[PDB]
């Protein structure tokens, strides 16, 4: 960011003005610029800048993680969270994956919210893990969540306890949704069981109004929302699940995910839901571990 006191120990405000005087205002400005020239120009000690460069790099630059360390860590950290639909967990290779943004693309009434609730209901009860359902279309209905939990468990209290773990937060504009994810990300950083599943229903609901016209700010907000989802998923190790609308291609005339081509690179795993009343087809439109094209029947009434 901007060179200021408290950004690094030993960084006095007196020299910060001196660095500004040579058009060095940012962290990348100080690191990139030749410090030997600045040390002579500003009168600042060269050993100080070299020490100042190292501490700034050690604070703002990500550090490489060895694959062996990451493999052992992800072995006991990543969790395959069952969606409660045995005919879909087979498609997802035993279910959802933490650390990935899973997208559930489909048309209206294709079961996108319904499968998301089952993911929320199963994680809330079966795995006893809290869920943050960020609904933008108003899809979540607490009666349906109770109805899903009633089928799984007949205990009066366990249904309420599972519902207690599902945190429903309503965000209908992009900035509200960005605020919720950032507020959640701060909550996880400051920590009682934390949030393990984040369900966004739907991303296309808030991003589609942004898209349109010569402005590219909608794409930036989309990618910033995409960045927030992936920071929640990969950094915080929670199974982020998002919901997307379906659209027909202008040229090829085939079903593709909405929010343009830029959003198509966002999710690690994508599930396509299309009607073949409750039977649906779940086609793995995008996967990082399984072939794309496999489709399995998914019935809503079995859940």
């Amino acid at each position: 960011g901007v060179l200021r006191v408290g950004l690094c120990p030993g960084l006095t405000e007196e020299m910060i003005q001196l660095l500004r005087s040579h058009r060095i205002k940012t962290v990348v400005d100080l690191v990139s610029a030749d410090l030997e020239e600045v040390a002579q120009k500003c009168g600042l000690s060269y050993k100080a800048l070299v020490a100042l460069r190292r501490v700034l790099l050690a604070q703002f630059s990500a550090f490489p993680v060895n694959g062996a360390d990451l493999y052992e860590e992800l072995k006991t950290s990543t969790a395959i969270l069952s969606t409660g639909i045995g005919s879909l967990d087979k498609l997802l290779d035993a279910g959802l994956y933490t650390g990935e943004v899973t997208e559930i693309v489909g048309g209206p009434g294709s079961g996108k919210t319904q499968v998301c609730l089952c993911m929320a209901a199963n994680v809330a009860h079966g795995l006893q893990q809290n869920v943050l359902y960020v609904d933008s279309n108003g899809g979540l209905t607490a009666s349906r969540l109770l109805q899903l939990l009633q089928a799984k468990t007949q205990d009066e209290e366990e249904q309420a306890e599972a519902l207690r773990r599902i945190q429903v937060v309503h965000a209908f504009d992009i900035f509200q949704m960005l605020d919720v994810l950032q507020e959640l990300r701060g909550t996880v950083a400051q920590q009682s069981g934390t949030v393990k599943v984040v369900v966004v229903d739907s991303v296309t609901a808030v991003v589609s109004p942004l898209l349109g016209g010569q402005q590219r700010e909608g794409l930036a907000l989309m990618m910033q929302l995409a960045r927030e989802l992936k920071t929640l998923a990969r950094d915080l190790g929670m199974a982020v699940v998002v919901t997307n609308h379906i659209t027909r291609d202008r040229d090829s005339g085939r079903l593709k995910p909405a929010l343009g081509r830029s959003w198509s690179f966002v999710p690690s795993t994508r599930i396509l839901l299309d009607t073949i009343g409750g039977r649906r087809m779940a086609c793995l439109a995008k996967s990082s571990r399984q072939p794309t094209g496999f489709q399995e029947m998914v019935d809503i009434g079995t859940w």
Binding site: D173, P209, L210, E217, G218
Partner: protein
């Protein structure tokens, strides 16, 4: 219908709109709040203040159904 000069917007704001071929309430409203943040400058909840201000000049007058029955008598 109504121009944006008579809505209540400032000369600086109207001129910034006039550079982008926006002169009526219809053109202003058709643009999404996000794309107005660059055409009109300003920020979200500041454009919405305009979006509420431009709407306040081209929105229907509330009529209580008792008044409609009363005016029909």
């Amino acid at each position: 219908s109504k121009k944006l000069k008579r809505v209540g917007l400032s000369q600086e704001l109207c001129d910034r709109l006039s550079r982008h071929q926006i002169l009526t309430c219809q053109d202003f409203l058709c643009l999404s709040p996000l794309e107005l943040m660059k055409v009109t400058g300003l920020s979200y909840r500041g454009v919405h203040e305009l979006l509420c201000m431009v709407s306040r000049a081209c929105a229907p007058k509330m009529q209580t159904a008792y008044g409609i029955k009363a005016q029909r008598s």
